[PDB]
Amino acid sequence: PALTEAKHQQQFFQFRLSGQTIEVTSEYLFRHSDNELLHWMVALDGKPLASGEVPLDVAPQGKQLIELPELPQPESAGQLWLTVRVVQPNATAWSEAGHISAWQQWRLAENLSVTLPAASHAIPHLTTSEMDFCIELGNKRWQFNRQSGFLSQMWIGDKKQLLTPLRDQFTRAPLDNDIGVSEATRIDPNAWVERWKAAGHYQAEAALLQCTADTLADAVLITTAHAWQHQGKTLFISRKTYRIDGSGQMAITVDVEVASDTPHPARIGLNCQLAQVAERVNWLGLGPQENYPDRLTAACFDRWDLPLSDMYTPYVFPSENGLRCGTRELNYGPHQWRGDFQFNISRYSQQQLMETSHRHLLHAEEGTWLNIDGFHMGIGGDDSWSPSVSAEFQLSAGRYHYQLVWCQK
């Protein structure tokens, strides 16, 4: 996936936007843009609104101004995005006709949604028992275990949707850059993986602090709090609310505290093993290829749809892989998650990826592992033998908040 990031940063055309004006500047020293045209497209949350093409005629080191036509207003809330691409209409000795050599995006107007949803046809019911809080709405049911404090099961009709409960996750199967030269036989205590190990990140267990249920006028509200500890120290505290309403949507709010003296965690998210396996993955976010916080410039915000296997990157030495960031909506099977998060989805658990040294030995687990992150650490790479993730990409804020809505589609 990194090749596309290299292609984008090494583009030969730079762009700036000012109003309706796109300014293209050429970084060629010797040739004129004689095999290039600029294609532009404006979309609202992925839905195309307008597009066009303009021939490019820029001298080496010169600039060309291009005026976009009047931007008819859009009829719906959402963020309009402008994408432009440089296409070479003619084949050359090194590329085929249609080759895209550069691209850029900008956000244009956004119209926030202020429209009150609509009174629910029904009100979910809360069934309380010694060991669980169950919620029923129509043909759906959610089960919250009172001793663990997690959503342990969800059913559509009589079909269970989870293989493992939905739980917070603060670690990732280590990348080569997280490992560096550390070896079981010669630990480099300064490498990220060793700092995480030593701190107990991979061994920490959730301790329940609170699990309550309340009924509201049109919803049931589950509140939980957990502490993650290691050798008597609290590493992380996660407080959440699950609000399930008459519409069937479950709104999840997550507020996490990370002790200041623990090494900054690899991610702050949730994970689960879904019971089902589906053919495609469809999302509104950055893509289409794998992208991470410190490696997402080449990805574009749009609506993407790929076969599930394209959501896994087969690095020979397996590790955390396949994330997509900047995602506002994710669809898989009958499920939909909405929010502003990063995610990866595949048949391999983080546990397996970290326990396996060669891709050929991985085996698809039952169901699908979904990792949805409110925040994810950068992957670094300035070098692969010392910590190289820049400060601005480390999860050092101390307190983090994210929210998601899981609903059926």
Added chain:
Amino acid sequence: RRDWENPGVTQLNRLAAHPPFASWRNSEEARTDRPSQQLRSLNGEWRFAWFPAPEAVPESWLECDLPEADTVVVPSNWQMHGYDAPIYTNVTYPITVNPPFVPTENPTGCYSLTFNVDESWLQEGQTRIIFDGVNSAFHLWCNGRWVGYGQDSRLPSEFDLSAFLRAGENRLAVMVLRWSDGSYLEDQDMWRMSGIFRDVSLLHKPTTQISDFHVATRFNDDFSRAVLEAEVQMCGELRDYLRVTVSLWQGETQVASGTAPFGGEIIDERGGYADRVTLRLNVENPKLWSAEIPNLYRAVVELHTADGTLIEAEACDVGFREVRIENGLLLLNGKPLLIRGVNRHEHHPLHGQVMDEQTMVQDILLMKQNNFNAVRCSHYPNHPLWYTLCDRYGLYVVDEANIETHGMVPMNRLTDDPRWLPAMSERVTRMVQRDRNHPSVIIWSLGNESGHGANHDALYRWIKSVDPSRPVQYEGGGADTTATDIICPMYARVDEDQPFPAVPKWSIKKWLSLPGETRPLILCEYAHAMGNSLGGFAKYWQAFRQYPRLQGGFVWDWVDQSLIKYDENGNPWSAYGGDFGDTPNDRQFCMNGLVFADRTPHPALTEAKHQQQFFQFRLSGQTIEVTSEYLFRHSDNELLHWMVALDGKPLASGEVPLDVAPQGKQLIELPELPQPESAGQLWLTVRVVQPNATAWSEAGHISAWQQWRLAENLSVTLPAASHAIPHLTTSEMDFCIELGNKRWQFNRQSGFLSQMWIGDKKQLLTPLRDQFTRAPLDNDIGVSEATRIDPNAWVERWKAAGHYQAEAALLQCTADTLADAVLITTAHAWQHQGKTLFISRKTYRIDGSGQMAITVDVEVASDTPHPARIGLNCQLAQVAERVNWLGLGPQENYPDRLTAACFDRWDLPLSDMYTPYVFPSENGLRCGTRELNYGPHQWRGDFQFNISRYSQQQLMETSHRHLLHAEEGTWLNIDGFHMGIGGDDSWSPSVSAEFQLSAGRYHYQLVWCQK
């Protein structure tokens, strides 16, 4: 003739410039710098009359005092006495631009003085008068007879009165013009005043005398040996019996001496200077001068007959130091400097531009106490005592010619014109002739904001020929022209380029490496301290320390140029541009100081002190590494104090002596620290304390500090159960919740908490509502004016988008009863002309313990300009004496200006939570706060806040601090997020992107409870 409309005549009959003389007739008085009977002060009471033009002055005045004259103190600026108004204009000239002419209405100040001269001064030798500063041009008469004329408001003009005086009573008449052709070279950004504003003195010299002397100090490779060379020139009776003896003293010990007859070496086909002599003294292991240790020797220059009669003696303090630029670096005594500088104008709120010793001393002490080591004389030579003080207290000085023609179009129109070369030359050459022997002067500057003209090139060269010991710098025309040895931009940013045509301001890091560039870079002005500013100051200091050729800079500027005015009641108040009827004017642009005009600090001063520290620290484990940034001294007056506290509660502390050599490091391993099982964050604070008093600081002065978070024990303890559940009562218009002695009322039409009762007392004067704006800072306004809006300024962008006038529309307001609480949920949209700018969703959960937890989630349209803050505000009913908080402090601190603040438990009087900036704006914020206590309230969370008796609306609507009035109750602003304040400059947006609130979605939470 109208010599004041002719740049070809800048003086008539004026004597040559030279270094400070006193004509002692006893060498030990010269050695000790005691007063000289031959140098008298004429300061005191003079007679003065104001005229609207020189054509209105009556002839009788030359011969006798005008009955309607007033008696006034001299030196003074006549505007300070009320005769006419001072004018505050920044770039535009205060007069019509039509060189070399001035207004025919040109305020003329007629000063006179009747004084005594003893016969002895007249029996022999020469008696001269010296006017250290006359603004801007003047004619002088003595006993009714015309003596001469002078220009250049900032250097001394001396005239020989020998033939005009008589024993006994004599009368001077000085006709001072406010405007003259010299005004075209005096366009500096400051109040435009006039008068005899520096000292007036009378000096007696013998007929055969020392007419000039220059002292140089050259060294061997390691500074273990020096040669002091003093060239001495004489005027008068040249005879074989004359000699010069120069002796050098360290305290009462004479370290070297040389005697020689006059007659310098042959220099050309016609011979040599028979009226000059150069003495060379060898000095072993000289004690070197620097701003860190201002070691000085005293050189006494005796003119005498060989058989022993001292004719007269002159003398100066000598600082052995070498200044040189080598391999791209400016070095002092062979080591690279790091300039912690500030620009300082000569300004006093009551006396105008008149300087006095007390004030100078007060400024030098505070400068040093705040870790400055350098000062630039923006933008003219200073009163002579300033140099003496910087030589003795130790500050590096940039001495600057009085040449600024900013208002010309283009700016170099005069400086590139050979017809103005003579007037400019005098401003440069006479400054060097006067101040060349002061060790504190390390760099000469050619003036300011006069573009780049060939006159600058010629003059750069002149100084380099006459004084090879100091580099020459000059910013005009792009800061890296051929007229400067140092790249010395003003307001270039650290990482951000500003590619203006012809004179771009490159990022300073990028500027150093442009193709072919090799010079050191020291900003002549940076970090414009106007109003609530200095945002981003730390970014500069991190760059300076990281890049060797980035050698610092001079902050703009030390002191606000505000002037005192008196109201009807007779109470003083700080005034700025236009407050005297002056127009056009540049309003508050005259106030850009780190300190107020009466020397009280602005909060930005502590940020400069901290970033300019001389010791850097690193913590590893319980090992503290201290590194010294001093170049020449060991830390012989410093100890390190350390303290660990848990959320403000002191746990342990200690002190350790610091012994680090210059550029050295010391490791200090701290004791076994506590590990309380009790929740909270442990914080380590270290401070460097000087146990002994110095010439510039008191015993115990703190010179540096730093803090680090140590272990944190997050709280996992559950709160006990409440023997109580709040009750809800509803009506169409409100939701009321009651719990014991407490009550909360939420309005269903507005969707806000409109009142709360504790006991049965109302707690709010205005409801609790979201706030997205701030009363704009000077940096938010920049140059925008109602008459000439600058649409790119932050304030204008917010105004145009409707942030200040957006109204909350209620989208949802519900109340639910929980197991042990009542929950109120609301959502509001802020719109403007149909555009939704922000959406606020919150929950308020009131539980059986009486606490109210508020959760707020805001959405900000990505296309509206990033807002100033995202927070809540309310007017509380109570006024309490103190404010106590756990968070950054104790002074005002903003996101981009909080490095100096330390996290601890602070407790101050309410009034200290307001900063009285002259031009009112949002102020008093404290960031990183975890708990805030005021009266019976306590708010906990992770927020920034301000609290005072003044609403944001009032601050935005009032132009001057003395017009503000305390409102009923106390206004509290509690922000989840607050935009940086900026300050890289005050006339374009300068808040760095990482300090702009552009995330789109923001979340914050607070708990409001009692106690």
